[PDB]
C-alpha cells in the first residue's frame, strides 16, 4: 500500500499543475474574446509564452513520476456505478489520440518510409546516438563561449576592452560635481552683487 | 519635477534596461533551444512539447530582435 | 440541408445572365407599376440595366440616388400578391464609394 | 493491433446465453481479444468436458495453478464487472499485468494513468503548435508603423446614418 | 454590369486531360486561433476533471478541482486505480519521436533564415527613409516626431509668420 | 516521394468502393474531422472520382447517394459543416426519411 | 470510438506539381508514363463480383 500512497501524492502534484494550466488557458481565452478584432501580437505572444512554461512544468512532473504512473492503471467501480449507466465514463477515461495527432503520426511514419527507401535501417540508430552526442557538445561549448564575452557595458567588446575604456557613472559624477560647484559660484556672485564681496 | 541631468540619465538607463533585456532574451532563448535539442530521453510525449517549445523560442528570438 | 448546402454547377451562361437581367428589370417594371406605394419624390424612375434607379437632388458633390432590384424568390410574382411589401435590394451612388 | 483505444462487445453472444452473469462475464471475456487462449482459465476449460463445476473451486484452482490468469476484481451484478490479467508465479502472490473493464455488456481496456495523462498533454501541445504556426506567419512588422495585421468625417457620416436609423426605428 | 458592355462581350463570344484541373481576414485568423485554444482547453479540462474525481475520493483538494457540472452529475469517490504493468514500448513510437524533433529543428532554422531576409528588406527601406531625413536636416530644417509616433514631420513654417505649420514626410512606396 | 505502388484492376474495384464510402455521411464526418479536406491532393482525387459518373462506370456503382454527396462536397463551407456533428445527423436523417 | 478505412495512398500522391509535370508531358507529345497510367480510368467488362 506504500506504492499506492506514493502514487497518490504523485498524481496530486500533477493535478495541481494541470489545474493551473486550465486557469491560464481560460485567461487566454478571455483576453482573446475581449476585443472584437484580434488582439495585439505582443500580448498574445506573451500568453503563448506563459502557456509554454505551464506545459513544460507538466511534462517534467510526468517524466519524474513516469515509473509510478505507468505502473498504475485506472478502472471505475463501486461509487461510480450509480452513474455507471452513462457513456460519459468512456469519453472521460478514453485515451484515443486526437484525430489530427493520429493522422500526423501516420504521415511522419510514411516519411520514415521514404527514408528507409533511401538507406538501410541498422545504420540509422548509431548515427542517431552520435548526433545526440553532437548536440550536448554544442551546448557546453556555447555556454563557455558565452561566459567568455562581456554584455552590459558601453562599447566594451573584447576588442574594445583592449582598445579603450568608457565610464557612464564617472561622467555622471563629473557633471554632478560641476553643477554643484557652479551653483556655489552662483550663490557667491549673488551675495557679491547684493553687498560687495569681490 | 526632476532635474535636467536626472532626465538625461533617466533616459539612458531606460534605453539600456530595454536593450539589455532584448539581447538577454536572444541569448537565453538560443541557450534553451540548445538545452532542449538533444533527443536522448525521447519520450515521444516529451518530444512533442519540446517541438512546441522550439517553435515558440525561435519566434521569441525574432521578437527580441525586432 | 442539401438545398441550403447545394451549389450549382460553376458555368453561368453569359447570354443567360443577360436574359435574366432583362427579365429582372422587366419584372421590376411589373412590380413597380403595380407596387402599391411610391413616394412622390420617387415618382420618376429609370429601370436601368439590371437595376432600378431613383434620383433626388442633393449636395456633398452628389445627388441622392438609389438603385433597387431584388433576390427574394418566393415573392417575385407574389410581390404582387404582397402589394403591401417586397424585399427590394439596393445600390446607391454618391461621391464616396466604399462606405 | 492496438488493444487499448478500442471498445468491444458481442451483444449477439450475450443474447445467445441470455443474461449477464459472473461466469458469463468470464466467458464473454473469453470471446474478447483481451483474453489470451494460452490462459490458465482456458487450460482448465479444456480439461473438463460438459460437467458441472463450482466457483469457489474456480478461484481455489486458479491459485493452485501457476501462470497467467483472469479473475474478477470487483463485481456489480446489475451492470458492470471488473477483470484483471494478473500473473501469479506462486500462490498467494500475484503481479497484475493488465486491468480490464466491463460495463453495460461492453468490455474496455481501462488503461494506465501515464498513457492517459500523456496523451492528453500531447493533444494540448498539438493544438498549441498548430495555432502558433498559423499565427506566426501572419503578422506584419514595420519598424515605424509597428506590428500590423493586413476618417472622423466618415465616422460622422456613419453617425448620421445610425441616427437616421434610430429615428426610423422609433417611428 | 452594363447592357452595352455585355452585348460587346457576348457579341465577341458569337465571333468564336480528362481530369478537370483547378488551381485573409484578421477575424478569420482570430476564429482559427480561438478554435484551437478552445479545443486545447476542453482536453485539459477533461484530464483535470478525471484526476479531480479520483483525488476527491482521497482528498479535499479535488472536490475543489472537479467541475461543478461533473460533481453535480456524478457521485464523488467514483473512480479507482490499481497497480498494473506498464505497456511494451513501440519501436515505431520512438522512431516517430526522433523524426519529430529533427523536423522541428530544421523548421526552426529555416524560419530564422526567412525572418532574417524579411527584416533585411525592412532595414533596407528604413535606411532609405532615414538617409532622406538626414538629407533634409542637413539643410537645417527642424523636424519633430509626429503625433502618431510614426515617421517624422518637417517644420516648413520655420522661416517666419504667425502660424506654425509642420508636415510629415512619408515614403510613397 | 515514394514510388507509386498501385494495381490496375484493383484500383477500380477500390475506387468503386470509395465512391460508396462517400455515400455514407458519417464517413464524411470522420473524414472532415481528420482534416482530409485540408489537402488539395484529395480534391483533385475527388475530380478523379468524377470518372465514375460516366454511364459504363456508373452502371457499376451501387449506392446512388455518393454521386449527390460528391456534388454536395464541392462546396467547402459544406466540408467544414460536415465536420459538425449536428449537420451530420441532419444529413443521415434526411436520407433515412427519403428511405 | 467508431472508425472507417482511410482512402487510397495515391490520393496522398497527388500534387499540382506532378499534374504540371504531366501536362508538360502532354506538351512534349518513365515517371510521367506511370503518372498517366495512374490517371486513366480503365473500366472492366466482365468476370468479378465480390467486395
PDB file of N, CA, C and O in Angstrom, chain E residues 81-128:
ATOM      1  N   UNK E  81      -8.105   3.031  -9.041  1.00  0.00           N
ATOM      2  CA  UNK E  81      -6.800   2.807  -9.637  1.00  0.00           C
ATOM      3  C   UNK E  81      -6.144   1.643  -8.913  1.00  0.00           C
ATOM      4  O   UNK E  81      -6.219   1.545  -7.685  1.00  0.00           O
ATOM      5  N   UNK E  82      -5.521   0.756  -9.680  1.00  0.00           N
ATOM      6  CA  UNK E  82      -4.817  -0.392  -9.132  1.00  0.00           C
ATOM      7  C   UNK E  82      -3.466  -0.522  -9.800  1.00  0.00           C
ATOM      8  O   UNK E  82      -3.305  -0.198 -10.981  1.00  0.00           O
ATOM      9  N   UNK E  83      -2.499  -1.014  -9.037  1.00  0.00           N
ATOM     10  CA  UNK E  83      -1.202  -1.300  -9.623  1.00  0.00           C
ATOM     11  C   UNK E  83      -1.373  -2.279 -10.776  1.00  0.00           C
ATOM     12  O   UNK E  83      -2.201  -3.192 -10.727  1.00  0.00           O
ATOM     13  N   UNK E  84      -0.616  -2.044 -11.840  1.00  0.00           N
ATOM     14  CA  UNK E  84      -0.709  -2.814 -13.068  1.00  0.00           C
ATOM     15  C   UNK E  84       0.676  -2.834 -13.706  1.00  0.00           C
ATOM     16  O   UNK E  84       1.669  -2.440 -13.087  1.00  0.00           O
ATOM     17  N   UNK E  85       0.758  -3.300 -14.942  1.00  0.00           N
ATOM     18  CA  UNK E  85       2.085  -3.368 -15.509  1.00  0.00           C
ATOM     19  C   UNK E  85       2.153  -2.496 -16.753  1.00  0.00           C
ATOM     20  O   UNK E  85       1.221  -2.506 -17.566  1.00  0.00           O
ATOM     21  N   UNK E  86       3.221  -1.708 -16.912  1.00  0.00           N
ATOM     22  CA  UNK E  86       3.262  -0.732 -17.999  1.00  0.00           C
ATOM     23  C   UNK E  86       3.407  -1.421 -19.361  1.00  0.00           C
ATOM     24  O   UNK E  86       3.932  -2.537 -19.440  1.00  0.00           O
ATOM     25  N   UNK E  87       2.970  -0.767 -20.426  1.00  0.00           N
ATOM     26  CA  UNK E  87       2.897  -1.446 -21.725  1.00  0.00           C
ATOM     27  C   UNK E  87       4.246  -1.512 -22.418  1.00  0.00           C
ATOM     28  O   UNK E  87       5.158  -0.730 -22.151  1.00  0.00           O
ATOM     29  N   UNK E  88       4.347  -2.472 -23.334  1.00  0.00           N
ATOM     30  CA  UNK E  88       5.550  -2.617 -24.138  1.00  0.00           C
ATOM     31  C   UNK E  88       5.742  -1.384 -25.005  1.00  0.00           C
ATOM     32  O   UNK E  88       4.785  -0.836 -25.559  1.00  0.00           O
ATOM     33  N   UNK E  89       6.987  -0.935 -25.109  1.00  0.00           N
ATOM     34  CA  UNK E  89       7.274   0.239 -25.916  1.00  0.00           C
ATOM     35  C   UNK E  89       7.254  -0.134 -27.394  1.00  0.00           C
ATOM     36  O   UNK E  89       7.685  -1.224 -27.780  1.00  0.00           O
ATOM     37  N   UNK E  90       6.728   0.768 -28.221  1.00  0.00           N
ATOM     38  CA  UNK E  90       6.583   0.530 -29.653  1.00  0.00           C
ATOM     39  C   UNK E  90       7.764   1.146 -30.390  1.00  0.00           C
ATOM     40  O   UNK E  90       8.031   2.342 -30.250  1.00  0.00           O
ATOM     41  N   UNK E  91       8.467   0.321 -31.165  1.00  0.00           N
ATOM     42  CA  UNK E  91       9.609   0.801 -31.937  1.00  0.00           C
ATOM     43  C   UNK E  91       9.206   1.961 -32.841  1.00  0.00           C
ATOM     44  O   UNK E  91       9.880   3.004 -32.886  1.00  0.00           O
ATOM     45  N   UNK E  92       8.084   1.800 -33.548  1.00  0.00           N
ATOM     46  CA  UNK E  92       7.555   2.868 -34.391  1.00  0.00           C
ATOM     47  C   UNK E  92       7.363   4.154 -33.603  1.00  0.00           C
ATOM     48  O   UNK E  92       7.555   5.253 -34.132  1.00  0.00           O
ATOM     49  N   UNK E  93       6.987   4.027 -32.333  1.00  0.00           N
ATOM     50  CA  UNK E  93       6.704   5.189 -31.499  1.00  0.00           C
ATOM     51  C   UNK E  93       7.966   6.023 -31.251  1.00  0.00           C
ATOM     52  O   UNK E  93       7.963   7.251 -31.427  1.00  0.00           O
ATOM     53  N   UNK E  94       9.067   5.372 -30.867  1.00  0.00           N
ATOM     54  CA  UNK E  94      10.307   6.108 -30.633  1.00  0.00           C
ATOM     55  C   UNK E  94      10.861   6.685 -31.930  1.00  0.00           C
ATOM     56  O   UNK E  94      11.259   7.858 -31.978  1.00  0.00           O
ATOM     57  N   UNK E  95      10.898   5.877 -32.999  1.00  0.00           N
ATOM     58  CA  UNK E  95      11.356   6.418 -34.281  1.00  0.00           C
ATOM     59  C   UNK E  95      10.528   7.626 -34.696  1.00  0.00           C
ATOM     60  O   UNK E  95      11.048   8.576 -35.303  1.00  0.00           O
ATOM     61  N   UNK E  96       9.237   7.601 -34.370  1.00  0.00           N
ATOM     62  CA  UNK E  96       8.384   8.770 -34.527  1.00  0.00           C
ATOM     63  C   UNK E  96       8.953   9.967 -33.768  1.00  0.00           C
ATOM     64  O   UNK E  96       9.218  11.020 -34.359  1.00  0.00           O
ATOM     65  N   UNK E  97       9.176   9.811 -32.456  1.00  0.00           N
ATOM     66  CA  UNK E  97       9.691  10.919 -31.646  1.00  0.00           C
ATOM     67  C   UNK E  97      10.931  11.561 -32.270  1.00  0.00           C
ATOM     68  O   UNK E  97      11.000  12.789 -32.448  1.00  0.00           O
ATOM     69  N   UNK E  98      11.926  10.739 -32.609  1.00  0.00           N
ATOM     70  CA  UNK E  98      13.150  11.275 -33.196  1.00  0.00           C
ATOM     71  C   UNK E  98      12.864  12.013 -34.503  1.00  0.00           C
ATOM     72  O   UNK E  98      13.376  13.120 -34.733  1.00  0.00           O
ATOM     73  N   UNK E  99      12.026  11.421 -35.366  1.00  0.00           N
ATOM     74  CA  UNK E  99      11.665  12.096 -36.613  1.00  0.00           C
ATOM     75  C   UNK E  99      11.045  13.473 -36.346  1.00  0.00           C
ATOM     76  O   UNK E  99      11.352  14.461 -37.038  1.00  0.00           O
ATOM     77  N   UNK E 100      10.194  13.554 -35.320  1.00  0.00           N
ATOM     78  CA  UNK E 100       9.541  14.808 -34.952  1.00  0.00           C
ATOM     79  C   UNK E 100      10.551  15.877 -34.570  1.00  0.00           C
ATOM     80  O   UNK E 100      10.472  17.020 -35.037  1.00  0.00           O
ATOM     81  N   UNK E 101      11.479  15.541 -33.677  1.00  0.00           N
ATOM     82  CA  UNK E 101      12.430  16.559 -33.247  1.00  0.00           C
ATOM     83  C   UNK E 101      13.311  17.028 -34.395  1.00  0.00           C
ATOM     84  O   UNK E 101      13.572  18.230 -34.532  1.00  0.00           O
ATOM     85  N   UNK E 102      13.795  16.101 -35.222  1.00  0.00           N
ATOM     86  CA  UNK E 102      14.642  16.516 -36.338  1.00  0.00           C
ATOM     87  C   UNK E 102      13.899  17.498 -37.241  1.00  0.00           C
ATOM     88  O   UNK E 102      14.422  18.574 -37.584  1.00  0.00           O
ATOM     89  N   UNK E 103      12.652  17.164 -37.600  1.00  0.00           N
ATOM     90  CA  UNK E 103      11.860  18.095 -38.403  1.00  0.00           C
ATOM     91  C   UNK E 103      11.668  19.427 -37.682  1.00  0.00           C
ATOM     92  O   UNK E 103      11.664  20.490 -38.319  1.00  0.00           O
ATOM     93  N   UNK E 104      11.530  19.390 -36.353  1.00  0.00           N
ATOM     94  CA  UNK E 104      11.364  20.619 -35.579  1.00  0.00           C
ATOM     95  C   UNK E 104      12.565  21.546 -35.742  1.00  0.00           C
ATOM     96  O   UNK E 104      12.412  22.736 -36.049  1.00  0.00           O
ATOM     97  N   UNK E 105      13.770  21.018 -35.530  1.00  0.00           N
ATOM     98  CA  UNK E 105      14.963  21.839 -35.695  1.00  0.00           C
ATOM     99  C   UNK E 105      15.048  22.414 -37.100  1.00  0.00           C
ATOM    100  O   UNK E 105      15.237  23.626 -37.269  1.00  0.00           O
ATOM    101  N   UNK E 106      14.905  21.571 -38.128  1.00  0.00           N
ATOM    102  CA  UNK E 106      15.006  22.104 -39.488  1.00  0.00           C
ATOM    103  C   UNK E 106      13.998  23.226 -39.720  1.00  0.00           C
ATOM    104  O   UNK E 106      14.333  24.269 -40.308  1.00  0.00           O
ATOM    105  N   UNK E 107      12.763  23.040 -39.244  1.00  0.00           N
ATOM    106  CA  UNK E 107      11.763  24.101 -39.315  1.00  0.00           C
ATOM    107  C   UNK E 107      12.281  25.388 -38.683  1.00  0.00           C
ATOM    108  O   UNK E 107      12.205  26.469 -39.285  1.00  0.00           O
ATOM    109  N   UNK E 108      12.830  25.283 -37.471  1.00  0.00           N
ATOM    110  CA  UNK E 108      13.299  26.466 -36.756  1.00  0.00           C
ATOM    111  C   UNK E 108      14.387  27.205 -37.535  1.00  0.00           C
ATOM    112  O   UNK E 108      14.330  28.433 -37.693  1.00  0.00           O
ATOM    113  N   UNK E 109      15.398  26.482 -38.016  1.00  0.00           N
ATOM    114  CA  UNK E 109      16.486  27.176 -38.693  1.00  0.00           C
ATOM    115  C   UNK E 109      16.000  27.825 -39.988  1.00  0.00           C
ATOM    116  O   UNK E 109      16.392  28.960 -40.306  1.00  0.00           O
ATOM    117  N   UNK E 110      15.110  27.150 -40.728  1.00  0.00           N
ATOM    118  CA  UNK E 110      14.528  27.787 -41.908  1.00  0.00           C
ATOM    119  C   UNK E 110      13.816  29.082 -41.535  1.00  0.00           C
ATOM    120  O   UNK E 110      14.010  30.124 -42.179  1.00  0.00           O
ATOM    121  N   UNK E 111      12.994  29.037 -40.480  1.00  0.00           N
ATOM    122  CA  UNK E 111      12.270  30.234 -40.061  1.00  0.00           C
ATOM    123  C   UNK E 111      13.223  31.373 -39.737  1.00  0.00           C
ATOM    124  O   UNK E 111      12.959  32.529 -40.088  1.00  0.00           O
ATOM    125  N   UNK E 112      14.340  31.070 -39.074  1.00  0.00           N
ATOM    126  CA  UNK E 112      15.302  32.129 -38.787  1.00  0.00           C
ATOM    127  C   UNK E 112      15.876  32.703 -40.070  1.00  0.00           C
ATOM    128  O   UNK E 112      16.102  33.915 -40.163  1.00  0.00           O
ATOM    129  N   UNK E 113      16.097  31.859 -41.080  1.00  0.00           N
ATOM    130  CA  UNK E 113      16.585  32.373 -42.357  1.00  0.00           C
ATOM    131  C   UNK E 113      15.596  33.355 -42.968  1.00  0.00           C
ATOM    132  O   UNK E 113      15.951  34.493 -43.302  1.00  0.00           O
ATOM    133  N   UNK E 114      14.339  32.938 -43.126  1.00  0.00           N
ATOM    134  CA  UNK E 114      13.408  33.829 -43.812  1.00  0.00           C
ATOM    135  C   UNK E 114      13.144  35.091 -42.997  1.00  0.00           C
ATOM    136  O   UNK E 114      13.069  36.192 -43.560  1.00  0.00           O
ATOM    137  N   UNK E 115      13.034  34.960 -41.668  1.00  0.00           N
ATOM    138  CA  UNK E 115      12.879  36.141 -40.823  1.00  0.00           C
ATOM    139  C   UNK E 115      14.036  37.110 -41.022  1.00  0.00           C
ATOM    140  O   UNK E 115      13.830  38.327 -41.120  1.00  0.00           O
ATOM    141  N   UNK E 116      15.260  36.593 -41.111  1.00  0.00           N
ATOM    142  CA  UNK E 116      16.386  37.466 -41.423  1.00  0.00           C
ATOM    143  C   UNK E 116      16.201  38.158 -42.767  1.00  0.00           C
ATOM    144  O   UNK E 116      16.514  39.346 -42.908  1.00  0.00           O
ATOM    145  N   UNK E 117      15.691  37.446 -43.769  1.00  0.00           N
ATOM    146  CA  UNK E 117      15.562  38.080 -45.076  1.00  0.00           C
ATOM    147  C   UNK E 117      14.532  39.205 -45.047  1.00  0.00           C
ATOM    148  O   UNK E 117      14.797  40.317 -45.535  1.00  0.00           O
ATOM    149  N   UNK E 118      13.352  38.946 -44.465  1.00  0.00           N
ATOM    150  CA  UNK E 118      12.323  39.986 -44.420  1.00  0.00           C
ATOM    151  C   UNK E 118      12.788  41.182 -43.594  1.00  0.00           C
ATOM    152  O   UNK E 118      12.598  42.335 -43.998  1.00  0.00           O
ATOM    153  N   UNK E 119      13.439  40.932 -42.457  1.00  0.00           N
ATOM    154  CA  UNK E 119      13.939  42.051 -41.674  1.00  0.00           C
ATOM    155  C   UNK E 119      15.035  42.807 -42.409  1.00  0.00           C
ATOM    156  O   UNK E 119      15.249  43.994 -42.143  1.00  0.00           O
ATOM    157  N   UNK E 120      15.743  42.151 -43.330  1.00  0.00           N
ATOM    158  CA  UNK E 120      16.737  42.881 -44.109  1.00  0.00           C
ATOM    159  C   UNK E 120      16.065  43.785 -45.133  1.00  0.00           C
ATOM    160  O   UNK E 120      16.524  44.910 -45.366  1.00  0.00           O
ATOM    161  N   UNK E 121      14.979  43.318 -45.756  1.00  0.00           N
ATOM    162  CA  UNK E 121      14.181  44.228 -46.576  1.00  0.00           C
ATOM    163  C   UNK E 121      13.708  45.426 -45.754  1.00  0.00           C
ATOM    164  O   UNK E 121      13.844  46.585 -46.176  1.00  0.00           O
ATOM    165  N   UNK E 122      13.172  45.158 -44.559  1.00  0.00           N
ATOM    166  CA  UNK E 122      12.691  46.221 -43.676  1.00  0.00           C
ATOM    167  C   UNK E 122      13.799  47.228 -43.386  1.00  0.00           C
ATOM    168  O   UNK E 122      13.629  48.441 -43.564  1.00  0.00           O
ATOM    169  N   UNK E 123      14.948  46.740 -42.917  1.00  0.00           N
ATOM    170  CA  UNK E 123      16.060  47.631 -42.616  1.00  0.00           C
ATOM    171  C   UNK E 123      16.494  48.385 -43.858  1.00  0.00           C
ATOM    172  O   UNK E 123      16.964  49.522 -43.768  1.00  0.00           O
ATOM    173  N   UNK E 124      16.326  47.788 -45.035  1.00  0.00           N
ATOM    174  CA  UNK E 124      16.695  48.493 -46.254  1.00  0.00           C
ATOM    175  C   UNK E 124      15.810  49.714 -46.465  1.00  0.00           C
ATOM    176  O   UNK E 124      16.313  50.837 -46.628  1.00  0.00           O
ATOM    177  N   UNK E 125      14.483  49.526 -46.453  1.00  0.00           N
ATOM    178  CA  UNK E 125      13.598  50.682 -46.606  1.00  0.00           C
ATOM    179  C   UNK E 125      13.897  51.718 -45.534  1.00  0.00           C
ATOM    180  O   UNK E 125      14.069  52.908 -45.828  1.00  0.00           O
ATOM    181  N   UNK E 126      13.990  51.265 -44.283  1.00  0.00           N
ATOM    182  CA  UNK E 126      14.325  52.153 -43.177  1.00  0.00           C
ATOM    183  C   UNK E 126      15.553  52.998 -43.496  1.00  0.00           C
ATOM    184  O   UNK E 126      15.540  54.225 -43.350  1.00  0.00           O
ATOM    185  N   UNK E 127      16.623  52.349 -43.947  1.00  0.00           N
ATOM    186  CA  UNK E 127      17.826  53.077 -44.320  1.00  0.00           C
ATOM    187  C   UNK E 127      17.529  54.121 -45.387  1.00  0.00           C
ATOM    188  O   UNK E 127      18.051  55.241 -45.326  1.00  0.00           O
ATOM    189  N   UNK E 128      16.686  53.782 -46.368  1.00  0.00           N
ATOM    190  CA  UNK E 128      16.332  54.748 -47.409  1.00  0.00           C
ATOM    191  C   UNK E 128      15.686  55.993 -46.805  1.00  0.00           C
ATOM    192  O   UNK E 128      16.192  57.124 -46.940  1.00  0.00           O
TER     193      UNK E 128
END
